[PDB]
Amino acid sequence: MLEQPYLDLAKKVLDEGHFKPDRTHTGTYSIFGHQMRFDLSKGFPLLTTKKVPFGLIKSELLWFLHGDTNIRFLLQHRNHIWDEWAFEKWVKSDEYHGPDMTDFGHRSQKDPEFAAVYHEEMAKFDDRVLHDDAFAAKYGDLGLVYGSQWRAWHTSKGDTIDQLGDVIEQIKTHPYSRRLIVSAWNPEDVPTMALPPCHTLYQFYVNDGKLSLQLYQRSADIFLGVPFNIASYALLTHLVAHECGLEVGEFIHTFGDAHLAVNHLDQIKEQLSRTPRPAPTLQLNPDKHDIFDFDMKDIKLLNYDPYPAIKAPVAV
Amino acid sequence: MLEQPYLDLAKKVLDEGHFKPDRTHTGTYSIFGHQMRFDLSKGFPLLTTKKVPFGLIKSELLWFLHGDTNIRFLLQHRNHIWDEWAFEKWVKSDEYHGPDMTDFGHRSQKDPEFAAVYHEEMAKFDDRVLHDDAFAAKYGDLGLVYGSQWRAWHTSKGDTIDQLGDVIEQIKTHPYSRRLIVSAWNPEDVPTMALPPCHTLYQFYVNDGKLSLQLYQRSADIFLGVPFNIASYALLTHLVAHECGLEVGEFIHTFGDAHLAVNHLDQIKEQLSRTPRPAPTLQLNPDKHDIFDFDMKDIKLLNYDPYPAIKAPVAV
Numbered sequence: 001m002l003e004q005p006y007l008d009l010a011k012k013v014l015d016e017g018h019f020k021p022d023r024t025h026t027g028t029y030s031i032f033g034h035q036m037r038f039d040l041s042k043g044f045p046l047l048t049t050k051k052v053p054f055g056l057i058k059s060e061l062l063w064f065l066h067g068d069t070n071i072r073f074l075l076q077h078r079n080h081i082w083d084e085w086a087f088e089k090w091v092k093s094d095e096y097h098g099p100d101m102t103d104f105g106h107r108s109q110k111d112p113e114f115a116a117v118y119h120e121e122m123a124k125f126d127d128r129v130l131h132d133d134a135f136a137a138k139y140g141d142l143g144l145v146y147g148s149q150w151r152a153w154h155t156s157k158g159d160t161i162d163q164l165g166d167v168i169e170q171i172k173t174h175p176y177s178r179r180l181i182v183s184a185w186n187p188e189d190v191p192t193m194a195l196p197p198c199h200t201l202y203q204f205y206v207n208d209g210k211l212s213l214q215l216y217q218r219s220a221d222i223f224l225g226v227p228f229n230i231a232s233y234a235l236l237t238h239l240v241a242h243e244c245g246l247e248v249g250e251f252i253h254t255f256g257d258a259h260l261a262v263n264h265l266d267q268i269k270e271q272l273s274r275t276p277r278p279a280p281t282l283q284l285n286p287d288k289h290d291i292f293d294f295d296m297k298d299i300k301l302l303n304y305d306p307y308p309a310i311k312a313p314v315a316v
Numbered sequence: 317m318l319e320q321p322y323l324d325l326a327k328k329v330l331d332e333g334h335f336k337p338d339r340t341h342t343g344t345y346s347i348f349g350h351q352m353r354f355d356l357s358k359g360f361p362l363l364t365t366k367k368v369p370f371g372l373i374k375s376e377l378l379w380f381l382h383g384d385t386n387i388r389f390l391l392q393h394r395n396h397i398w399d400e401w402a403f404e405k406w407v408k409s410d411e412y413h414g415p416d417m418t419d420f421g422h423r424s425q426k427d428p429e430f431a432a433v434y435h436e437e438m439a440k441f442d443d444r445v446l447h448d449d450a451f452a453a454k455y456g457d458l459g460l461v462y463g464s465q466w467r468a469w470h471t472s473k474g475d476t477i478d479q480l481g482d483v484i485e486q487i488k489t490h491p492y493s494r495r496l497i498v499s500a501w502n503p504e505d506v507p508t509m510a511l512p513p514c515h516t517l518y519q520f521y522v523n524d525g526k527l528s529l530q531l532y533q534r535s536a537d538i539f540l541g542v543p544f545n546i547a548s549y550a551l552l553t554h555l556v557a558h559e560c561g562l563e564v565g566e567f568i569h570t571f572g573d574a575h576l577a578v579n580h581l582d583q584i585k586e587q588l589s590r591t592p593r594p595a596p597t598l599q600l601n602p603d604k605h606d607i608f609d610f611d612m613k614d615i616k617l618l619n620y621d622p623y624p625a626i627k628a629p630v631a632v
């Protein structure tokens with residue numbers, strides 16, 4: 001079925017990946033270099049063998065797409081994927097006056113009595129970002145994230161490039177171009193960012209009226225990360241194809257280091273017992289064409305019928 | 317044999333690639349997204365089914381490695397891969413006083429009586445670059461090429477990053493790093509360079525004392541280009557492994573658009589009749605460790621026994 005490539009990457013890491021330490025007290029099993037294809041005319045690759053929240057995956061992408069770097073848009077669609085990086089900033093800053101909150105990510109997962117204060121402060125931090133304008137502008141704004149790297153790359157003569165807007169324009173006028181490339185890796189920010197981007201670079205490709213997209217992903221968490229990554233970029237393929245009025249082609253997903261966390265073996269094995277169902281269909285608004293001004297209600301998912309979600313611990 | 321992946325990419329493009337126009341009056345057959353592996357402990361992947369000039373492939377890489385961007389180093393090892401980009405500059409410039417030389421690449425291949433003056437001027441241009449210092453500095457210097465993109469990426473606050481020197485340092489001290497990435501794509505130069513780099517980005521990887529390298533190549537000429545590309549980067553894998561004292565692992569070659577030019581079908585079919593021979597062995601100087609100061613005589617090839625070379629026309 002559509003998703004087999006992903007079930008094949010999980011199996012491949014299980015009986016083939018080697019043990020490799022990382023930023024965590026536990027390790028990972030990992031491989032290096034891996035490529036998968038999804039024919040997007042076959043259906044949309046949201047996993048069926050595990051419930052994946054599309055609304056999250058899509059409100060994040062819109063954010064990227066508007067070139068926004070402020071958490072606030074996200075909070076307003078109840079999407080919190082990005083709160084820990086914002087709130088970190090808050091905490092290491094003058095203006096903050098609360099229980100230190102040092103190394104809160106690790107310590108969220110030991111103490112059930114800290115994990116309860118972290119969850120209080122965070123709710124207030126989210127609250128202030130949502131209502132206090134001055135506040136958002138100071139700690140709601142992440143600075144370097146995909147949205148500005150895509151739509152406002154800072155030059156050396158202090159202006160701004162919209163890589164993606166220009167690229168889309170190129171697709172419209174030089175479809176056979178071999179240089180349709182949006183990159184998110186700036187070698188001058190990289191050594192001082194707490195997260196240099198995982199989604200390093202991608203490249204668009206046109207042939208016979210079809211748009212395809214290859215993603216170069218330096219590092220992928222097979223269980224938690226890669227199910228979301230797949231849908232993000234398959235959605236982007238669709239949106240760009242829609243804006244250029246091209247038919248949709250293939251999403252190619254290339255990896256550097258694909259890993260599975262050692263405390264996720266059981267969950268992943270559980271996943272491999274399930275038998276894929278038919279893929280959902282994606283469905284974009286026909287009246288609206290500028291994808292830059294797309295909203296939530298413009299992108300529908302149809303016939304998504306997943307297995308239950310698989311809760312799992314996180315890696316810290 | 318070691319090279320099968322390449323013979324498998326050529327076949328794959330033959331009975332599977334679709335017709336696609338490009339910068340040339342002829343087309344290309346092409347595919348999008350492709351990955352190959354070469355286990356470098358099995359031997360060095362210089363093609364055996366077609367004579368490939370190692371000396372060229374290596375004097376180019378040393379140049380990159382010294383962070384040089386001046387043609388002159390190259391001329392001094394009789395390597396001309398880069399002369400047309402230098403000389404172009406010359407020609408569209410005040411100081412030049414000769415037969416116009418407009419669109420010389422196309423017109424080199426029609427007129428056997430132009431192709432003879434182009435070959436005269438070029439010999440003089442090469443001569444001046446070799447002997448006139450002021451001259452080299454003005455037209456010998458290509459500006460943006462791999463050597464400065466690797467070793468002197470210009471920042472926004474007007475300094476210089478040595479991506480590769482830093483990366484190597486990282487390999488030495490954080491071998492399990494998932495961010496060992498040297499990128500050659502600067503979104504701010506890209507729209508005004510006559511050749512935005514083909515070799516877009518690469519990433520190093522370490523496990524069990526072995527170094528591997530994945531290359532993201534946006535565009536590859538399967539017949540002319542890709543045999544050289546393979547050895548460049550397999551050499552680089554070796555040199556970096558040597559400097560970090562790690563064993564050598566795999567070279568993974570990832571492609572965006574892999575193409576074959578329509579006037580190279582016959583040559584490629586001829587190539588597929590040949591039967592690979594055993595791979596040559598690479599052999600680097602043990603006394604010298606700083607790869608930045610490696611010379612020609614420090615890198616030997618052993619037991620390279622190729623088939624004859626396959627001359628072919630070029631695409632213009």
Ligand SMILES: O=c1ccn([C@H]2C[C@H](O)[C@@H](COP(=O)(O)O)O2)c(=O)[nH]1
Nearest residue numbers: 198219220221222225226229494495
């Ligand atoms: O969409 C995402 C976002 C993050 N990660 C993971 C990969 C790693 O587990 C971690 C990044 O750590 P480094 O790879 O930078 O060291 O985030 C994913 O797999 N997918």
Ligand SMILES: O=c1ccn([C@H]2C[C@H](O)[C@@H](COP(=O)(O)O)O2)c(=O)[nH]1
Nearest residue numbers: 178179514535536537538541542545
């Ligand atoms: O080492 C090299 C250098 C160049 N090319 C080719 C690929 C294309 O034929 C051409 C670049 O043109 P664009 O892809 O930028 O349009 O150079 C290679 O395959 N390998």
